[PDB]
Amino acid sequence: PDLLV
Amino acid sequence: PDLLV
Amino acid sequence: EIITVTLKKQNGMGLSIVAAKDKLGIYVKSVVKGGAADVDGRLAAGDQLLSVDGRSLVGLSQERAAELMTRTSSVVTLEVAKQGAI
Amino acid sequence: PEIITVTLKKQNGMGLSIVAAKDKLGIYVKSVVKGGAADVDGRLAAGDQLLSVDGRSLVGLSQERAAELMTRTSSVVTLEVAKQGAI
C-alpha cells in the first residue's frame, strides 16, 4: 500500500 | 529518456 | 543527515509522448503507472493525441507538443485516436 | 480508428510516492516520480524519511494522514528530510 504526494 | 507531459 | 528541501508543486497527465510520421503526429509511447492517464484507464500506448484544448497536435515536434500540453490549466481536454496507426 | 474525447485533471504535487513504516511510525519515500518536482530538484531519493511538512511532524501517523497534511499545503511546501532514514 502506497500513496502519491 | 522520456518526454513527459 | 538532516536537510531542508522546499518544493514547488507541479502538474502532469502521466504520459510519455513521441512524434512520428504526410505530417507529424503525437503518439503515446507509455502511460505512466499511477498517473492521471493511468487512473482514468482510457489512454494506452499507441494512441494518437490529435489535440489539446481545441488546438491541433498534428504537424509539430515532440517538444512543441510538450510546450502546448504543459502551458494549460489543471484540467486538459484531449481528442484521441485509439491506436493511431489506422 | 475509434476517436474518443478524454478529459484529465492533472495530478498536482511534489512527485513523491510515500510509505509509512516503523517505535513510532515514519514517512518514507518509496519512489521519486520521474520528471516530477522532487526529481527536477534532485535532492530527494528513495529511502529518505520525511520528518516534517511546514513545521508539522510527520512521525507517528499513517500514510493517509501524512498525505492529508502534505496536500493541504499551498503551492510551495517545506520538508525536513533525514537522508536514508533507515538508521
Author numbering:
A (entry chain D): 118 to 122
B (entry chain C): 100 to 104
C (entry chain B): 2 to 22, 27 to 91
D (entry chain A): 1 to 22, 27 to 91
Give excerpts from the publication:
The C-terminus of the severe acute respiratory syndrome coronavirus 2 (SARS-CoV-2) protein E contains a PBM (PDZ-binding motif) targeting PDZ (PSD-95/Dlg/ZO-1) domains, which is identical to the PBM of SARS-CoV. Targeting multiple cellular PDZ (PSD-95/Dlg/ZO-1)-containing proteins through short linear PDZ-binding motifs (PBMs) is a common strategy used by viruses to facilitate their viral replication and dissemination to new hosts. PBMs are mainly located at the C-terminus of target proteins and interact directly with PDZ domains.
MLLT4 is an adapter protein linking nectin to the actin cytoskeleton, essential for the formation of adherent junctions and the regulation of cell adhesion. The crystal structure of MLLT4-PDZ in complex with SARS-CoV-2-E-PBM peptide was solved at a resolution of 2.28 Å. The final refined model contains two PDZ domains per asymmetric unit that adopt a swapped dimer conformation with the PDZ folding comprising five β strands and two α helices. The C-terminal carboxylate of Val at position 0 of the PBM forms three hydrogen bonds with the amide protons of Met 1018, Gly 1019, and Leu 1020 of the “GLGF” loop of MLLT4-PDZ. In addition, the carbonyl and the amide group of Leu at position -2 interacts through a hydrogen bond with the proton amide and the carbonyl group of Ile 1022, respectively. A hydrogen bond is also formed between the carboxyl at the end of the side chain of Asp at position -3 of the PBM and the hydroxyl of Ser 1021 of the β2 strand.
